[PDB]
Symmetry: C3
Amino acid sequence: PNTYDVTTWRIKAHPEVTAQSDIGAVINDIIADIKQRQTSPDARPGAAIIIPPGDYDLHTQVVVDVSYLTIAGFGHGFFSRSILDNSNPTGWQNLQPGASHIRVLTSPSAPQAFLVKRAGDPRLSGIVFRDFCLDGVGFTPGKNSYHNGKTGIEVASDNDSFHITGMGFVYLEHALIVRGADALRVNDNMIAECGNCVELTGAGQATIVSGNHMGAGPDGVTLLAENHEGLLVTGNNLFPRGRSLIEFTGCNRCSVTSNRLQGFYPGMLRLLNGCKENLITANHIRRTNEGYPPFIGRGNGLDDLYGVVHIAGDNNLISDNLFAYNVPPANIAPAGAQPTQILIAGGDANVVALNHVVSDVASQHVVLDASTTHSKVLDSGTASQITSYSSDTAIRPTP
Amino acid sequence: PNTYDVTTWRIKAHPEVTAQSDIGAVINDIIADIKQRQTSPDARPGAAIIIPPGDYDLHTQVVVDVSYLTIAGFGHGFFSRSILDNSNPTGWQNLQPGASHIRVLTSPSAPQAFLVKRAGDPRLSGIVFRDFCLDGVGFTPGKNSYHNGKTGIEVASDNDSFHITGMGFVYLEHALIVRGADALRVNDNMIAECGNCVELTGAGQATIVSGNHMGAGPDGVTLLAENHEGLLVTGNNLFPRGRSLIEFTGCNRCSVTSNRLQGFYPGMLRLLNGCKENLITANHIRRTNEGYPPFIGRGNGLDDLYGVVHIAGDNNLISDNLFAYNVPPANIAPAGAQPTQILIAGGDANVVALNHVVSDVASQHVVLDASTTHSKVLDSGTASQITSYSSDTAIRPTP
Amino acid sequence: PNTYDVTTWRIKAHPEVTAQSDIGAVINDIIADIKQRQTSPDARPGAAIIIPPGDYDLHTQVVVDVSYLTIAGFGHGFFSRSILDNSNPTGWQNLQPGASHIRVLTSPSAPQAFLVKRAGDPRLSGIVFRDFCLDGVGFTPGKNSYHNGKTGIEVASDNDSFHITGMGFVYLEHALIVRGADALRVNDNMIAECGNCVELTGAGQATIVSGNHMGAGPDGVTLLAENHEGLLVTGNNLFPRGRSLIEFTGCNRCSVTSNRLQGFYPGMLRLLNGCKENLITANHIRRTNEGYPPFIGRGNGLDDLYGVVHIAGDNNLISDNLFAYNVPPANIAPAGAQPTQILIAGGDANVVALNHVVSDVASQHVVLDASTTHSKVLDSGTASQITSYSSDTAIRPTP
């Protein structure tokens, strides 16, 4: 009851249109049957759509407008298309992603493989996307462009209690997008080799993003949050080459703790457009130079004075973090300049304590620009590893 | 084998008593069939009971007395009954919780939808409750009373290695209760709009509570632990309006790290009745005033001198936490008083370091009561933001 | 499609060889059917093998050589064989592990129940092992030897994006072994009463080990990592009696945060053979004496001067940790000696800040060996609780 398997469900008016040829069409017809059956606002339990291990083409965009809809598979089936595209495939035993593998072949007019949205009142709630694979197949024009105009899962209407777990996103310009997320949970996912990984736009409340593996694109974001409050970002392993790895714009009282960050460019952690009262602590932050040839020489347009961690806001606490910076003097922007680990761009009352810096070159562990006021820097470097352009800054040397 | 679907299983002596009319009766008959079949202590594998997407009524309490029993659904199906009850339902497309939705309609004499217990020896082990929804339907007498005498899942016997994940608890006076929990794991659950969310009573060992979303009631607790040792509470997003968000009574050597806490009342984090050697660190603690009208004016009976964080015990380390306190002067109890962020009620050797406070009013960041001895306060406020009623307190100003 | 249930699948050449008699043989015949069918490198989605609740004997080793293979059950079914073996079974209602219970009865020539490996190019990817149980049945010659030569799951070839979750490992000499792990994820598992729990050998990158429950053997490791970079170990509850609880040899830039550690011996946390730039923070570290008689009197061969936390490497940051040490003066090695909480064995630039120690005896909170250089000790003890055998050490007294 209320359980479908995409492979057994035939579209009554279109019999040879299978999950293999257009799983998008199949799922839309299943949702149509669900709405068929559950007409009572007091009797709309939802359903579960199971996606068996296999290769499926999605040409038709799926519009999800029923609450408590669960689309689940048996695996994330990640596979590095990046390495395939920059390697010699001869004799290779696998050329593509697996598990419950959905190949997103969407048209410009309907980018998103899955678009969750509904008008009217009750906001959509309890939708679960899990254990399956969304593959963008390839990048266009350049095979290493991270561009292709496709999106995996996009939530455009205010939603409550959404759950996104065990997924596999690969080669999508935008993997996951969620606007107006409330009590959202994104955990235990593998999102990589995407232009953008997770985008929490609009605004948000009490959202949790943990246990995830993410890697974005030079012109994209890894984790982006817009006007969020109560966001918890923890236990994630964010690796190479978003323009940033964690980027908050105007979020307040959020927390970024117990994470592993590795980037090849300036500004891996960004608190922009006045983020207030956030906690960034117990994270491992490592900045280094791009090591895979296909991408050598590419950047995010920022120089090393932007800072590995860029803060623009008030009362944020950046502490108990370990900074490992290894970058060739020759790749450092501007020539002759000392890399900045933590830049307090503007804002009042920011506090920077117990931040260990390890760098191959002379570096300013903390820089407080002339816009800042009443900043606090404790045990984050010797007096000559700290630059204060303000005069009310209180500094305490790491002995 | 050993797999049942609640919708296909008929009760031999009672054929029209379905999962829809009394899933409680259905599951008890299934357990009776399991015991039927597995009579050998050396041959009791257990079984899995699957609950398909749907609306099911539970009138009969389920007594779970077999080890390794798995009851799973396809979704947590949370839905805010609170907002429905305080809104105008006209034209609303949903009026109820979804997914594998169980409506708890229990009688006073058997409160708990599920009661796990067994006499004799081997303690119950390996029981798993996952991916389904427990809904208390409503609150009684007042629609906003958070009272109804119903409980979702209750474990009354000593247990080992229990697993509670992906659940959805809503409108229950008591969502989950687990006595004598050992190696228990509560993770990735949505427990809200309940009088009480998670209650670990009796005593406990090496338990883990992480990745959860919890919201309780004014007269209830969000997360409560009794005489626990080795408890790890991490990566949880605890929001509004338990009387407390985290409450330990006499627990020793436990840890509360990387969490997001938001409360509307005094004492969100409580270490009572001599809790010893606990670590409270890397948490974002935000206290503010109740913002949803139906509940404006209700409290937990505590004043602002109780402290957002209340500690009564020895050798506890409260550090690297961010306190964001925004409360109207007029809502502050007692009139004229300065809100206390951290109150060290009694105890020896407590240590409070690197705790950033942000508040709209003059506040005492740390207060050491006259009962305290040998406390340590480092970088948690200026001398005038710190009150020590003891004389052996060692304090180091945030410069 | 591509979904198998071990109990329904007959081995054409050997019909009475069932999952109950040799699930190993059964799974190998299923993999053979998968390779039978998916012969195209461009069409190798993989499959799912479901293991129903039950008791299954594994005599034949399973060789997993297909990408995106998912083997899942309905439970971890943990059960303490240790307590059974040291107790009086009379009237016991359970004498064995449950759920999807696989009894590993492997022969010396093929130790591993599951051996994942493949030659040729693409590295194996997306393999998922979840929600089932691997039981070694017993220890041999001594019932409490933690030796039996059996291994649960072993990955011998370079792998990518493997996922190991919801598992139950019990009484195995080696529970899980994964060489050349990359973007690996080990989370939400119960690995205990095993000689060794998790062994990440060879080398590794961006691996995550979180939400796990682990307990090893006196002669084994709980969590071991070899030449790993980007490892995140967070939210785990590691309990008694590995020789160590966390042991890194030559790992760089890894992070161990928000964990609960409990050991009965010296060196519960070890950074050996030059581990550089690692973060060890926000962990609860509790060292005490063995309390279960069968094992009283057995050690790990190390004395109390090895330190609960042993660091040999450069630029590591050990901070915001709570040390609870309770050990009988008489069990302390060498007689008269003061236990060492943190020992900086060798290395340059290590930093030790805000580490609270609680112990029943006089103890040296931090000891910097004569090999160390430029170490930093802040707020981790009074001057007499700190021993520096170097002269360039910078120390700041906990007031």
